[PDB]
Amino acid sequence: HVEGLIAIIVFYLLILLVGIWAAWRTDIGLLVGGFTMTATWVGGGYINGTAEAVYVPGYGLAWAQAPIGYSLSLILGGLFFAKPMRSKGYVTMLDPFQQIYGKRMGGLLFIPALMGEMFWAAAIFSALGATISVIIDVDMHISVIISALIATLYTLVGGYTDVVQLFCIFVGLWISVPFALSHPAVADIGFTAVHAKYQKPWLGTVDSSEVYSWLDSFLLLMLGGIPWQAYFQRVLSSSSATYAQVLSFLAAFGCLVMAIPAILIGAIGASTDWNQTAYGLPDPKTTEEADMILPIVLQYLCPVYISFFGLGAVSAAVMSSADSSILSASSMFARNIYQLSFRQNASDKEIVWVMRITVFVFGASATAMALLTKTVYGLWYLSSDLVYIVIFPQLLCVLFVKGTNTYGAVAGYVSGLFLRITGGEPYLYLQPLIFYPGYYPDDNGIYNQKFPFKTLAMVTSFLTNICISYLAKYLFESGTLPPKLDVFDAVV
Ligand SMILES: *[C@@H]1O[C@H](CO)[C@@H](O[C@@H]2O[C@H](CO)[C@@H](O[C@@H]3O[C@H](CO)[C@@H](O)[C@H](O)[C@@H]3O)[C@H](O)[C@H]2NC(C)=O)[C@H](O)[C@H]1NC(C)=O
Ligand SMILES: C[N+](C)(C)CCO
Ligand SMILES: [Cl-]
Ligand code: NA
């Protein structure tokens, strides 16, 4: 197993060097697109969130589903969505919705995408702030504010760096594991994977009653990661469809390669006798600092220059993801809402002036949410919840179903939102209203659900869209309803 890992890391390093040379020169070129897509996809959530999920007792590796689902989402996109979206003149993911349903429905569907982008930005800001606070020894709120300011300045100024940033992430992450593994306080991770030396084994467990919840979460992560503007901008900006498919496949492979050292760092943190280090007792989890485990491992189990290399890798990943997130949000707003829904005649100066103010407002909101949070994996998971509930069924309807109307879209929107909201939300303090079978009280008194209700909400939204569209089409034609009642003008 060691030889295979060495071979794959050597192969990835060699192809990275080839990509760097090719990008400097600018046959080859499909490599640099995949590398840039990988740099866009992998950020603060892929590293700190994965380490925190592996480290926390009660989660383990079994419940760290996001790094695998988000990689499978790229494969699914390249398989089924890249070609249908490429030959219709679309510039934004919201264009088909506005062209088929209307501008108001596009504006309505804009909200979950903005919420997801905001959650992702908050998560990555929290990750970078925690790293800066631990390694440089600064107050956490100041560190988060500094990280947000640096990201905003980088995005504004930027308007083959991605390949070099990916190289920095790869080298900085992979150079730290050998030094942390050799510390005297760390035990054999192969033993502690199953045998519970200091805490529960870091390979988790799934009970016979939680299989449906596990599948529900996995489906949410895998299907909610597809409809994002950061991916579709790259898909639409390709020169051919095969180019986009190969780019998606290479990006997925790169993300899978990137995920491994974070899991190793989480296991190392879970296999440490902290009484033998300068951190001392209590443990990083007895103190409410379990989301800081990667910087703590870098600072207290590695030499100083290794910790600085890890800091540089985290900074590179966070910058490369934040730039794309902010740009996608601002572009979506400035094109689809401000210039299409109203004020259709606007000069180019007005558009850039709108873009800058949107960038600042989005950054401020993400900074506030990052300041108010206490977990990185939670926001990374939640960034795709409403996307999966709302946007995915309607994308399926517009791409592959003929006969969709504005009526079915309204019905599906309302039904999906109702079911999801009524289900409950244990991260907040919202309580369920339906109480599906298998509910149990938590430590905080909040009821959790063992029934897979989010997938049910998604399927209900899709089926309601189809059924209401065809019912309206039958009703307005063939008499029955006179034409004056066609308010949406969807059937005429
Ligand atoms: C964290 O590590 C330190 C360092 O080893 C631990 O300190 C150790 O504490 C034990 C008891 O608390 C000491 O044992 C004592 O030995 C004397 C004989 O010298 C005996 O008469 C006493 O009754 C007691 O058994 C041990 O000497 C001491 N080690 C050092 C180097 O001072 C500490 O206990 C560790 N903390 C935890 C929670 O394990
Ligand atoms: C944008 N997502 C949150 C869906 C994936 C990040 O890796
Ligand atoms: Cl991320
Ligand atoms: Na990145």
Bound molecules: a molecule of 3 linked components (NAG-NAG-BMA), choline ion, chloride ion, sodium ion
> Rg to the nearest angstrom?
24 Å
Write the H/E string, N to C: HHHHHHHHHHHHHHHHHHHEEH
Strand order of the largest sheet: 1-2
What is the first-to-last residue Cα distance?
65 Å
Specify the structural class: mainly alpha
The helix content, as a percent range, equals 55-70%
Number of helices, where a helix is a run of at least 4 consecutive DSSP H or I residues: 20
Shape: globular
- How many beta-strand runs? 2
Strand content: under 5%
| Main beta-sheet annotation | 2 strands, antiparallel
List the helices and strands and how they pair.
Blueprint: H1 2-25, H2 30-41, H3 44-55, H4 66-80, H5 95-100, H6 103-136, H7 140-158, H8 161-174, H9 177-181, H10 189-195, H11 211-224, H12 229-236, H13 241-270, H14 293-300, H15 304-341, H16 348-372, H17 377-382, H18 385-400, H19 406-423, E1 440-441, E2 447-448, H20 453-476
Antiparallel strand pairs: 1-2
Helix pairs in contact: 1-8, 2-8, 2-13, 3-6, 3-13, 4-11, 4-13, 6-7, 6-14, 6-15, 6-16, 6-18, 7-15, 7-16, 8-15, 11-18, 13-14, 15-16, 18-19, 18-20, 19-20
